[PDB]
Design a protein around this ligand. Sequence first.
Ligand SMILES: Brc1c[nH]nc1-c1ccncc1
Length: 93
Amino acid sequence: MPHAFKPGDLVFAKMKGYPHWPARIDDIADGAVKPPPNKYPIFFFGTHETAFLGPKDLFPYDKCKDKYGKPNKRKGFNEGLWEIQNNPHASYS
Ligand SMILES: Brc1c[nH]nc1-c1ccncc1
């Protein structure tokens, strides 16, 4: 049943030194910098930063929110929890 990751998919994404973080697979706009091969453009909710990650660091949101979706002290985390639950597809400019 699982497919490859696609723009709009909601995830927790893992960065070194950070808790699993609410995020989405982003689109790539025309003329924008493309990701390296086998990586995805990840938009992190709350901080609104972007990084390029491979699937080993991407966890489906609905399967893993009971484990990763509790509030955390790190800057922007609880804001990101609100975004992913309440408007995950908005433009955060
Ligand atoms: Br983890 C995370 C949450 N927001 N931003 C990040 C991040 C951390 C490191 N490098 C790029 C982006």
